[PDB]
Design an enzyme around this catalytic site. Sequence first.
Site, short mmCIF file in Angstrom:
data_model
loop_
_atom_site.label_atom_id
_atom_site.label_comp_id
_atom_site.label_asym_id
_atom_site.label_seq_id
_atom_site.Cartn_x
_atom_site.Cartn_y
_atom_site.Cartn_z
N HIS A 54 1.56 -5.72 -11.64
CA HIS A 54 2.78 -5.66 -10.83
C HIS A 54 2.62 -6.42 -9.50
CE1 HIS A 54 0.82 -1.65 -9.48
NE2 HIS A 54 0.57 -2.57 -8.56
N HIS A 77 -0.82 -5.99 -7.42
CA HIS A 77 -1.96 -6.74 -7.94
C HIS A 77 -1.76 -8.22 -7.64
CE1 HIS A 77 -2.70 -3.17 -10.33
NE2 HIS A 77 -1.62 -3.37 -11.07
N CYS A 86 -10.56 26.90 -18.13
CA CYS A 86 -9.75 27.68 -19.06
C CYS A 86 -10.68 28.01 -20.22
CB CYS A 86 -8.56 26.88 -19.58
SG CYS A 86 -7.72 27.68 -20.98
N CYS A 119 -9.24 26.74 -23.80
CA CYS A 119 -9.40 25.31 -24.06
C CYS A 119 -10.88 24.95 -24.05
CB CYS A 119 -8.70 24.48 -23.00
SG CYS A 119 -6.92 24.36 -23.20
N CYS A 149 -2.95 27.16 -17.31
CA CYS A 149 -3.35 26.09 -18.22
C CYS A 149 -2.09 25.44 -18.78
CB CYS A 149 -4.19 26.64 -19.37
SG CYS A 149 -4.50 25.37 -20.58
N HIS A 173 -2.19 26.72 -22.75
CA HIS A 173 -1.98 28.13 -23.07
C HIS A 173 -1.04 28.90 -22.16
CE1 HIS A 173 -5.80 26.93 -24.95
NE2 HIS A 173 -5.37 27.70 -25.94
N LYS A 226 8.82 2.59 -0.30
CA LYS A 226 7.71 2.30 -1.19
C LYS A 226 8.30 1.89 -2.53
CE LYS A 226 3.94 4.43 -1.83
NZ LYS A 226 2.67 3.97 -2.46
N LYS A 284 9.51 2.44 -9.79
CA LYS A 284 10.48 2.26 -10.85
C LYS A 284 11.66 3.24 -10.74
CE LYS A 284 12.48 1.24 -14.82
NZ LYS A 284 11.62 0.89 -16.00
ZN ZN Z 1 -6.09 26.30 -22.22
#
Ligand code: ZN
Length: 500
Positions: free
Chosen positions: A19, A22, A127, A130, A144, A147, A297, A300
């Site tokens: 963009h 860069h 977690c 997980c 989480c 979950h 700033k 999009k």
């Molecule tokens: Zn989890």
Amino acid sequence: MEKVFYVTTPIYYVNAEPHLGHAYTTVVADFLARWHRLDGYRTFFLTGTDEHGETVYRAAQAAGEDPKAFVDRVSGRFKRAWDLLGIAYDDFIRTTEERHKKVVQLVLKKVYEAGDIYYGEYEGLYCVSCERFYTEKELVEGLCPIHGRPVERRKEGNYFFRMEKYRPWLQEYIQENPDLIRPEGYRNEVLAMLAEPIGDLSISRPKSRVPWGIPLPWDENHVTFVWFDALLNYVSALDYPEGEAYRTFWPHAWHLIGKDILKPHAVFWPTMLKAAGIPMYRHLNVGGFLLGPDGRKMSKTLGNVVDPFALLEKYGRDALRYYLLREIPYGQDTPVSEEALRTRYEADLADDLGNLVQRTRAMLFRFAEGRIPEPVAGEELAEGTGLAGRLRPLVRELKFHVALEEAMAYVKALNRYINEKKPWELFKKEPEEARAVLYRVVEGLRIASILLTPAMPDKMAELRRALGLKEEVRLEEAERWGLAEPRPIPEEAPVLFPKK
Ligand SMILES: [Zn+2]
């Protein structure tokens, strides 16, 4: 040999769509590199892509591609972008390259053995369901994201770099080297960052979580995390240890960055170099944001994005480059827009340069048989030969906009000159003087075209072809008067900057 210039751009996230940000940083580096080569400096201009990590790996898996094959492919977007922008880099460093990986491990080992890397445990959010850690940002209402249940605080170990240890040295080094960080405002912001403890730096992650990366030489179950991988590109590309490129260019290192990565370059990187026994870089040159037309700033969803490739496609690479270098004081947040580019394109380029070349060519055919006339002293215009001496420090102080302004002021002087002398009127009674005026305008243009070459190398070469001037040039040539030879100009030539 003594004149050496080394400039780097940050290496960019390999899967990012290139963009304006860069483009801008890379274009400024390109201008600096082309300017120094033009001025006889042995130069090295580096750019590249940051290819390891968790994020890119996630990307590759989503794409159903092997990580290596995925970065080999997507790193191509940046190479194409640079082609479109006319970026003449000397090397494109990719962190997946063996030459880079070897240096990362070599420096990791040195710093580790110097006593600056330890294994620490810094509690994080975990977690149990997980069976993985989560940053605050990834939680959904502190729960989480999977979950929808609370997470527990568990300690995870990672290797750390004793950065705080080097804070006093860094403070002192900045105080003793006030021009190290520029523009100045950024130096002050860095000193403010160093006003309090900066803690230590997390430098690795367990391979079980981030398999895509360079393993720590002393612990294969851990991979280098960002800092000691990406930042080292600046010396690995030079074959760091004992490569000649390193011995030659590192002593003159200039890093260009956007202010978004100020801390890693002004705080992290310096302490790392110090701990590794590597000389500090010479300058950290910090650019500002390129704001949207609305002064906000660029994003999009705000709907204020300015696309350099679309602009480039419409007005051409040279005009875009000129606009970016002329309109923005390097380091200062500045709004940009197609309208502002268009304004600069129609006045500075099409009018001051394009129309003048068109008029000069027509006049050369009418009053000089279609050849550059016999050389004559420059009189008031001879002053143009001192411009290179004035732009050298402006360019090296990052005042590109001022340097371009002075070069263009001379071009405006050439316009004013021909409009005041009126060769077409002088031709009747004094043909020689009419030819003398035209010579001064062409020689003045040769000079200005050289000064502007780093900004618009293609269009300036085109300008020189239009006037029968030698295309290949050197900055010192702009410092002597009378170099344009009395030769034929092409019988036909395109308008230098056609209407859009
Ligand atoms: Zn989890």
